[PDB]
Write a protein that binds this ligand. Sequence first.
Ligand SMILES: O=C1Nc2cccc(OC3CCOCC3)c2/C1=C/c1ccc2[nH]cnc2c1
Ligand SMILES: [Zn+2]
Length: 313
Amino acid sequence: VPLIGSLPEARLRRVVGQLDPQRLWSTYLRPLLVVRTPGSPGNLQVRKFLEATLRSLTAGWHVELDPFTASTPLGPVDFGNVVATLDPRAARHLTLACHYDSKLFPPGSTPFVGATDSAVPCALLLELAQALDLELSRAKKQAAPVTLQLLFLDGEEALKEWGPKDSLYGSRHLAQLMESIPHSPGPTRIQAIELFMLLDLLGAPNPTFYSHFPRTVRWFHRLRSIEKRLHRLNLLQSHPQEVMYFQPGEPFGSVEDDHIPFLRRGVPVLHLISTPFPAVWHTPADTEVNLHPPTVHNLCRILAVFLAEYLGL
Ligand SMILES: O=C1Nc2cccc(OC3CCOCC3)c2/C1=C/c1ccc2[nH]cnc2c1
Ligand SMILES: [Zn+2]
């Protein structure tokens, strides 16, 4: 049931046991469920919550901000990404990414906080850096050569409906900055990224994922192999069938998301997005109540394992 690189079943359980669903739901998810369109008092609130939550970690994450400003239909706008790098001097790193801005809808409609789009991912990343903190802290003390980088991207969502120059403000910029910064080896910080794992649209019930990239299908398989186990170990909730989320296959082929600026620059990209989109994207019906906490806590579990098998924690 396990491939090569896999964890031993004893660790895995020990690991899993470090996850704390109440923290996930009540510490990191519930307070992101505000409205956080770019340059909003809430888009600010969240940005600062992220910065300070991650900085509170023992492992010593080096958390920088990527503040900038860009011309957009609603005029000039003040964006700000949150780049948290566990070990900046290490040569390459796994990058988990997701955006923390909520799309902007017209005024008056019920306010849109996009539970799945993308707070549940933002929260997952947090719980993962916390659960596995001491483990990640070890690796960093023992000079591990591949570390972990958490990107919380602002300004994914258009402001006056999609378009190349009105979309992905946050990603398009950090990929621009990252390409300017030299790195040894490298030559740029863009090559630091050994793999761009992009979470988006997670937390709706009964999702389905696929390999939109054959460059990285190796890791999707693993992601699928990590599902069952856990199913075969009675460690997933509401998981009657064995493979359910990570299905086998190939295309669509692509859907436009925060990974794009980095693929132009030749980065390996695992797009980890629900295809199809939840039945609630893009409505004011994307709210804490329409999620499926089990499905959330399994994705967290799967991811947590992956992270441990990937960085050899
Ligand atoms: O922002 C948007 N408003 C729309 C309204 C109608 C259809 C749409 O999709 C078309 C257009 C581009 O995307 C795929 C088909 C969109 C849309 C795109 C989109 C895609 C993936 C995302 N992940 C997080 N926000 C996302 C937004
Ligand atoms: Zn969205």
